[PDB]
Structure 1
Amino acid sequence: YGAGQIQVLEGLEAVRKRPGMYIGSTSERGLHHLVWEIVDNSIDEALAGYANQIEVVIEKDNWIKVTDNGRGIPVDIQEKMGRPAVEVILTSSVVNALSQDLEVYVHRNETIYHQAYKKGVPQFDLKEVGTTDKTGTVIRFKADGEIFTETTVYNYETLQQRIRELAFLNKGIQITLRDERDEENVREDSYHYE
């Protein structure tokens, strides 16, 4: 309960109290904005010269998974908070605050690190769960139905349109959209402009 952790909790309270001020609306438009908030991080990492693939998956029950092959959100214990950098970054994330559940897997230092959250609150300390020969960041989230009180169901065409545009605007980045909500009938569109 240091000043750092107190500020974190106040920040989550503030986002959840006035979500529309952060993401425009809590309508279907705001729901889809959650995806762009996450994907923008991957785009910046690609433009910085450290990533070139981004994958957005609509999973069963309208979870969203975003994966990039960037450097991975750092995990070193931070000066300000005395907590892993990734935890500080995600506990101040609007998407995390407005998600009933969110998971991160960081591939970095030939290690896979995992943390989970509910409404932005970490459920356990960042944990090493395995090894890897890749780098990057995986984020999985389920939008909070307490916040998004019109719908929590994503529109494939809405995601598709903007993903295609993002690939066209940010040449060289391979951006893939896949709908896995119905395991019997899976749709994928992959964009890569030169």
Structure 2
Amino acid sequence: QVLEGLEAVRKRPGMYIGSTSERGLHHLVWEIVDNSIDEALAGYANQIEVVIEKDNWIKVTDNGRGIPVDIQEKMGRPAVEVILTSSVVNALSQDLEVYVHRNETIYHQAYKKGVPQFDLKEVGTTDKTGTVIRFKADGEIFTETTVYNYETLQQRIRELAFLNKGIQITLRDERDEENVREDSYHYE
């Protein structure tokens, strides 16, 4: 059960993500980015964008197939809900949002500490496929710092692009609207 899983992750977060230090905070980004890379290596995505948003929200966008939304056999819930309510990133985020572009439709769900706040809802239409995940790390868990280091993200994003040639991976810092930094990596 999903609620018992959320309890277990939040009780011993370091056993899942290594630590709750600044290292563990950045690990949240890598968990999400690794899923986008998996989708690229499977043959379905080639562009990943990581944005550090105002108040240290992280937004990760990919142009994969979109996390499936079909009503699943096990849970009787949309697949995306099942997948995200078992995500360690969701459990350790005070807030998380997903937008799935799939079936020419945009689907949205939001969560707090892993708990869905409402049922998956159709919010719009689209001519693309892919997934947007936005999350705010839980300061109750990450007690040292919740502020991302641009250089730390940049170094690993550049490395990921070099290791997975053909994937365009972009990093953008929007925390200061007057001074926005972007680096874009695409190895050939």
Aligned to 1:95: 89
In 2, Cα distance between the equivalents of 1:84 and 1:33?
Answer: 27
Deviation digits for residues 32-77 of structure 1 (CA, Å, limit 9, x no counterpart): 0000000000001000000000000000000000000000000000
Deviation digits for residues 143-182 of structure 1 (CA, Å, limit 9, x no counterpart): 0000000000000000000000000000000000000000
State the Cα distance separating 1:11 from its structure 2 match. Answer: 0.1
Task: Structure 1: state its 5+ residue gaps.
Answer: 1-6
SS in 1 for 2:110: strand
Deviation digits for residues 111-159 of structure 1 (CA, Å, limit 9, x no counterpart): 0000000000000000000000010000000000000000000000000
In 2, Cα distance between the equivalents of 1:137 and 1:168?
Answer: 23
In 2, Cα distance between the equivalents of 1:140 and 1:59?
Answer: 9
State the Cα distance separating 1:26 from its structure 2 match. Answer: 0.1
Could you tell me which of 1, 5, 16 is aligned with 1:22? 16
Give 4+ residue runs of structure 1 displaced > 4 Å after superposition: none
In 1, Cα distance between the equivalents of 2:131 and 2:163?
Answer: 22
Aligned to 2:114: 120
RMSD between superposed Cα atoms in Å: 0.2
Q: What percentage of residue pairs aligned between the two structures are identical?
A: 100
In 2, Cα distance between the equivalents of 1:149 and 1:90?
Answer: 23
In 1, Cα distance between the equivalents of 2:100 and 2:175?
Answer: 24
SS in 1 for 2:40: helix
In 1, Cα distance between the equivalents of 2:168 and 2:132?
Answer: 16
SS in 2 for 1:124: coil
SS in 2 for 1:58: strand
SS in 2 for 1:106: strand
SS in 1 for 2:38: helix
In 2, Cα distance between the equivalents of 1:187 and 1:63?
Answer: 16
State the Cα distance separating 1:27 from its structure 2 match. Answer: 0.1
Aligned to 1:12: 6
Q: TM-score, normalised by structure 1?
A: 0.97
SS in 1 for 2:123: strand
Aligned to 1:3: none
Aligned residues: 188
State the Cα distance separating 1:78 from its structure 2 match. Answer: 0.1
SS in 2 for 1:138: strand
State the Cα distance separating 1:187 from its structure 2 match. Answer: 0.1
State the Cα distance separating 1:98 from its structure 2 match. Answer: 0.0
Q: TM-score, normalised by structure 2?
A: 1.00
In 1, Cα distance between the equivalents of 2:38 and 2:85?
Answer: 20
